Design a protein around this motif. Structure first.
Motif, PDB file in Angstrom:
ATOM      1  N   UNK B  24      12.456   3.666   5.745  1.00 20.01           N
ATOM      2  CA  UNK B  24      11.270   4.865   6.330  1.00 20.01           C
ATOM      3  C   UNK B  24      11.817   5.267   7.583  1.00 20.01           C
ATOM      4  N   UNK B  69       6.465   9.295  15.310  1.00 22.24           N
ATOM      5  CA  UNK B  69       6.749   8.134  14.756  1.00 22.24           C
ATOM      6  C   UNK B  69       5.162   7.403  14.288  1.00 22.24           C
TER       7      UNK B  69
ATOM      8  N   UNK C   1      11.026   3.802  16.650  1.00 21.47           N
ATOM      9  CA  UNK C   1      10.938   3.531  15.406  1.00 21.47           C
ATOM     10  C   UNK C   1       9.407   3.786  14.562  1.00 21.47           C
ATOM     11  N   UNK C   2       9.446   3.951  13.253  1.00 20.07           N
ATOM     12  CA  UNK C   2       8.357   4.556  12.665  1.00 20.07           C
ATOM     13  C   UNK C   2       7.178   3.264  12.374  1.00 20.07           C
ATOM     14  N   UNK C   3       5.909   3.809  12.649  1.00 25.26           N
ATOM     15  CA  UNK C   3       4.732   3.027  12.149  1.00 25.26           C
ATOM     16  C   UNK C   3       4.732   2.864  10.701  1.00 25.26           C
ATOM     17  N   UNK C   4       4.377   1.755   9.867  1.00 25.71           N
ATOM     18  CA  UNK C   4       4.242   1.566   8.549  1.00 25.71           C
ATOM     19  C   UNK C   4       3.168   2.701   8.319  1.00 25.71           C
ATOM     20  N   UNK C   5       3.264   3.208   7.042  1.00 27.79           N
ATOM     21  CA  UNK C   5       2.424   3.914   6.457  1.00 27.79           C
ATOM     22  C   UNK C   5       1.482   3.171   5.439  1.00 27.79           C
ATOM     23  N   UNK C   6       0.492   3.516   5.056  1.00 28.11           N
ATOM     24  CA  UNK C   6      -0.149   2.882   3.860  1.00 28.11           C
ATOM     25  C   UNK C   6       0.395   2.661   2.671  1.00 28.11           C
TER      26      UNK C   6
END
Ligand SMILES: C[n+]1cccc(CNC(=O)[C@@H]2CCCN2C(=O)[C@H](N)Cc2ccccc2)c1
Ligand SMILES: *[C@@H]1O[C@H](CO)[C@@H](O)[C@H](O)[C@H]1NC(C)=O
Ligand code: NA
Ligand code: NA
Lengths: 28, 251, 11
Positions: B24, B69, C1-6
């Motif tokens: 991701x 983010x 960094x990226x937050x988890x997506x649904x």
């Protein structure tokens, strides 16, 4: 779209963003 | 974006983030041009020198975003791709000539305060506004410097540059399908797109009808914000016949 | 960094 390029939070409400005037001033 | 500023909320509601599923991560910028179509740079999807060749299932688009983010619950919308269309004469081998691609969404996205399409220019609006000295606006979540990343969407206004100056700034062959923008060393102001901003829009607000038009797509540059260098943008109007053909055929 | 997506979007 008939409504393309008109922002809900700006043009649609007749509010200007902080730097769009810089663009207009350049269009001489 | 180098030497830009934080965007205002809803300032660029056509801004789209191209997002890789696994791992991701941000892949590119892009723009919303209707409820079902997203415009980007071809090199965001296909660039063999870097082993890049994405298929529909590799990607998502995230629309309505501000934070780079965060998952922006109740604001952003995430869409799957039905089909990617790359310009058939896109030149990835040499100079990124015709650096343009379309993505059709599986389902229409709902417009909101934060999600709204940009206009594509007609011949007259293009002729009127694509002039040296006239400024446009570039937005993206790409690098803040050539050699980190922003918390939120960045914006910078930059003047279109005279074609001979663009040509004389680089050894790369420039074509009529590109234009360049940025300040000259003697101008005192700075700013540029950078890696990660690829595919994002260069927009201008028409003083005739007060609507925003997408004139360019972030395509290429040598370094970011270097003195005597300029950012190069895909000339959207010059490739609009292809855009229309794809949408008319596959819409 | 990226937050988890649904998860719904990754299926
Ligand atoms: C204004 N800007 C500055 C730096 C990078 C970018 C985004 N484009 C890129 O990173 C693109 C993708 C392929 C190589 N890119 C480049 O910009 C290369 N640095 C220069 C180049 C131009 C044309 C053909 C080959 C190489 C934009
Ligand atoms: C890129 O991917 C497509 C499909 O997977 C493939 O057919 C093509 O040969 C690849 N290389 C290109 C388009 O340069
Ligand atoms: Na040259
Ligand atoms: Na420069």
């Amino acid at each position: 779209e008939a409504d393309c390029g008109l922002r809900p939070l700006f043009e649609k409400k007749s509010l200007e963003d902080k730097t769009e005037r810089e663009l207009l001033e350049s269009y001489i | 974006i180098v030497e830009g500023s934080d965007a205002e909320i809803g300032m660029s509601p056509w801004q789209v983030m191209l997002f890789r599923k696994s791992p991701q991560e941000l892949l590119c910028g892009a723009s919303l041009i209707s409820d079902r179509w997203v415009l980007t740079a071809a090199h965001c999807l296909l660039y063999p020198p870097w082993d890049k060749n994405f298929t529909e299932n590799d990607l998502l688009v995230r629309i309505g975003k501000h934070s780079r983010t965060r998952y922006e619950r109740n604001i952003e919308k995430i869409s799957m791709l039905e089909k990617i269309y790359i310009h058939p004469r896109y030149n990835w081998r040499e100079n990124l000539d015709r650096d343009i691609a379309l993505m059709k969404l599986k389902k229409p996205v709902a417009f909101s305060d934060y999600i709204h399409p940009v206009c594509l220019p007609d011949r007259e609006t293009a002729a009127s506004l694509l002039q040296a000295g006239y400024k446009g606006r570039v937005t993206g979540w790409g690098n803040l410097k050539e050699t980190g990343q922003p918390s939120v969407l960045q914006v910078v206004n930059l003047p279109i540059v005279e074609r001979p100056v663009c040509k004389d700034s680089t050894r790369i062959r420039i074509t009529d399908n590109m234009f360049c923008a940025g300040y000259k060393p003697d101008e005192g102001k700075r700013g540029d797109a950078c890696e990660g901003d690829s595919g994002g829009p260069f927009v201008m607000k028409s003083p005739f009808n007060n609507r925003w038009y997408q004139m360019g797509i972030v395509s290429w540059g040598e370094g970011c914000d270097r003195d005597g260098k300029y950012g190069f943008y895909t000339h959207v109007f010059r490739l609009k016949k292809w855009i229309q053909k794809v949408i008319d055929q596959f819409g | 960094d990226f937050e988890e997506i649904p998860e719904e979007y990754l299926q």
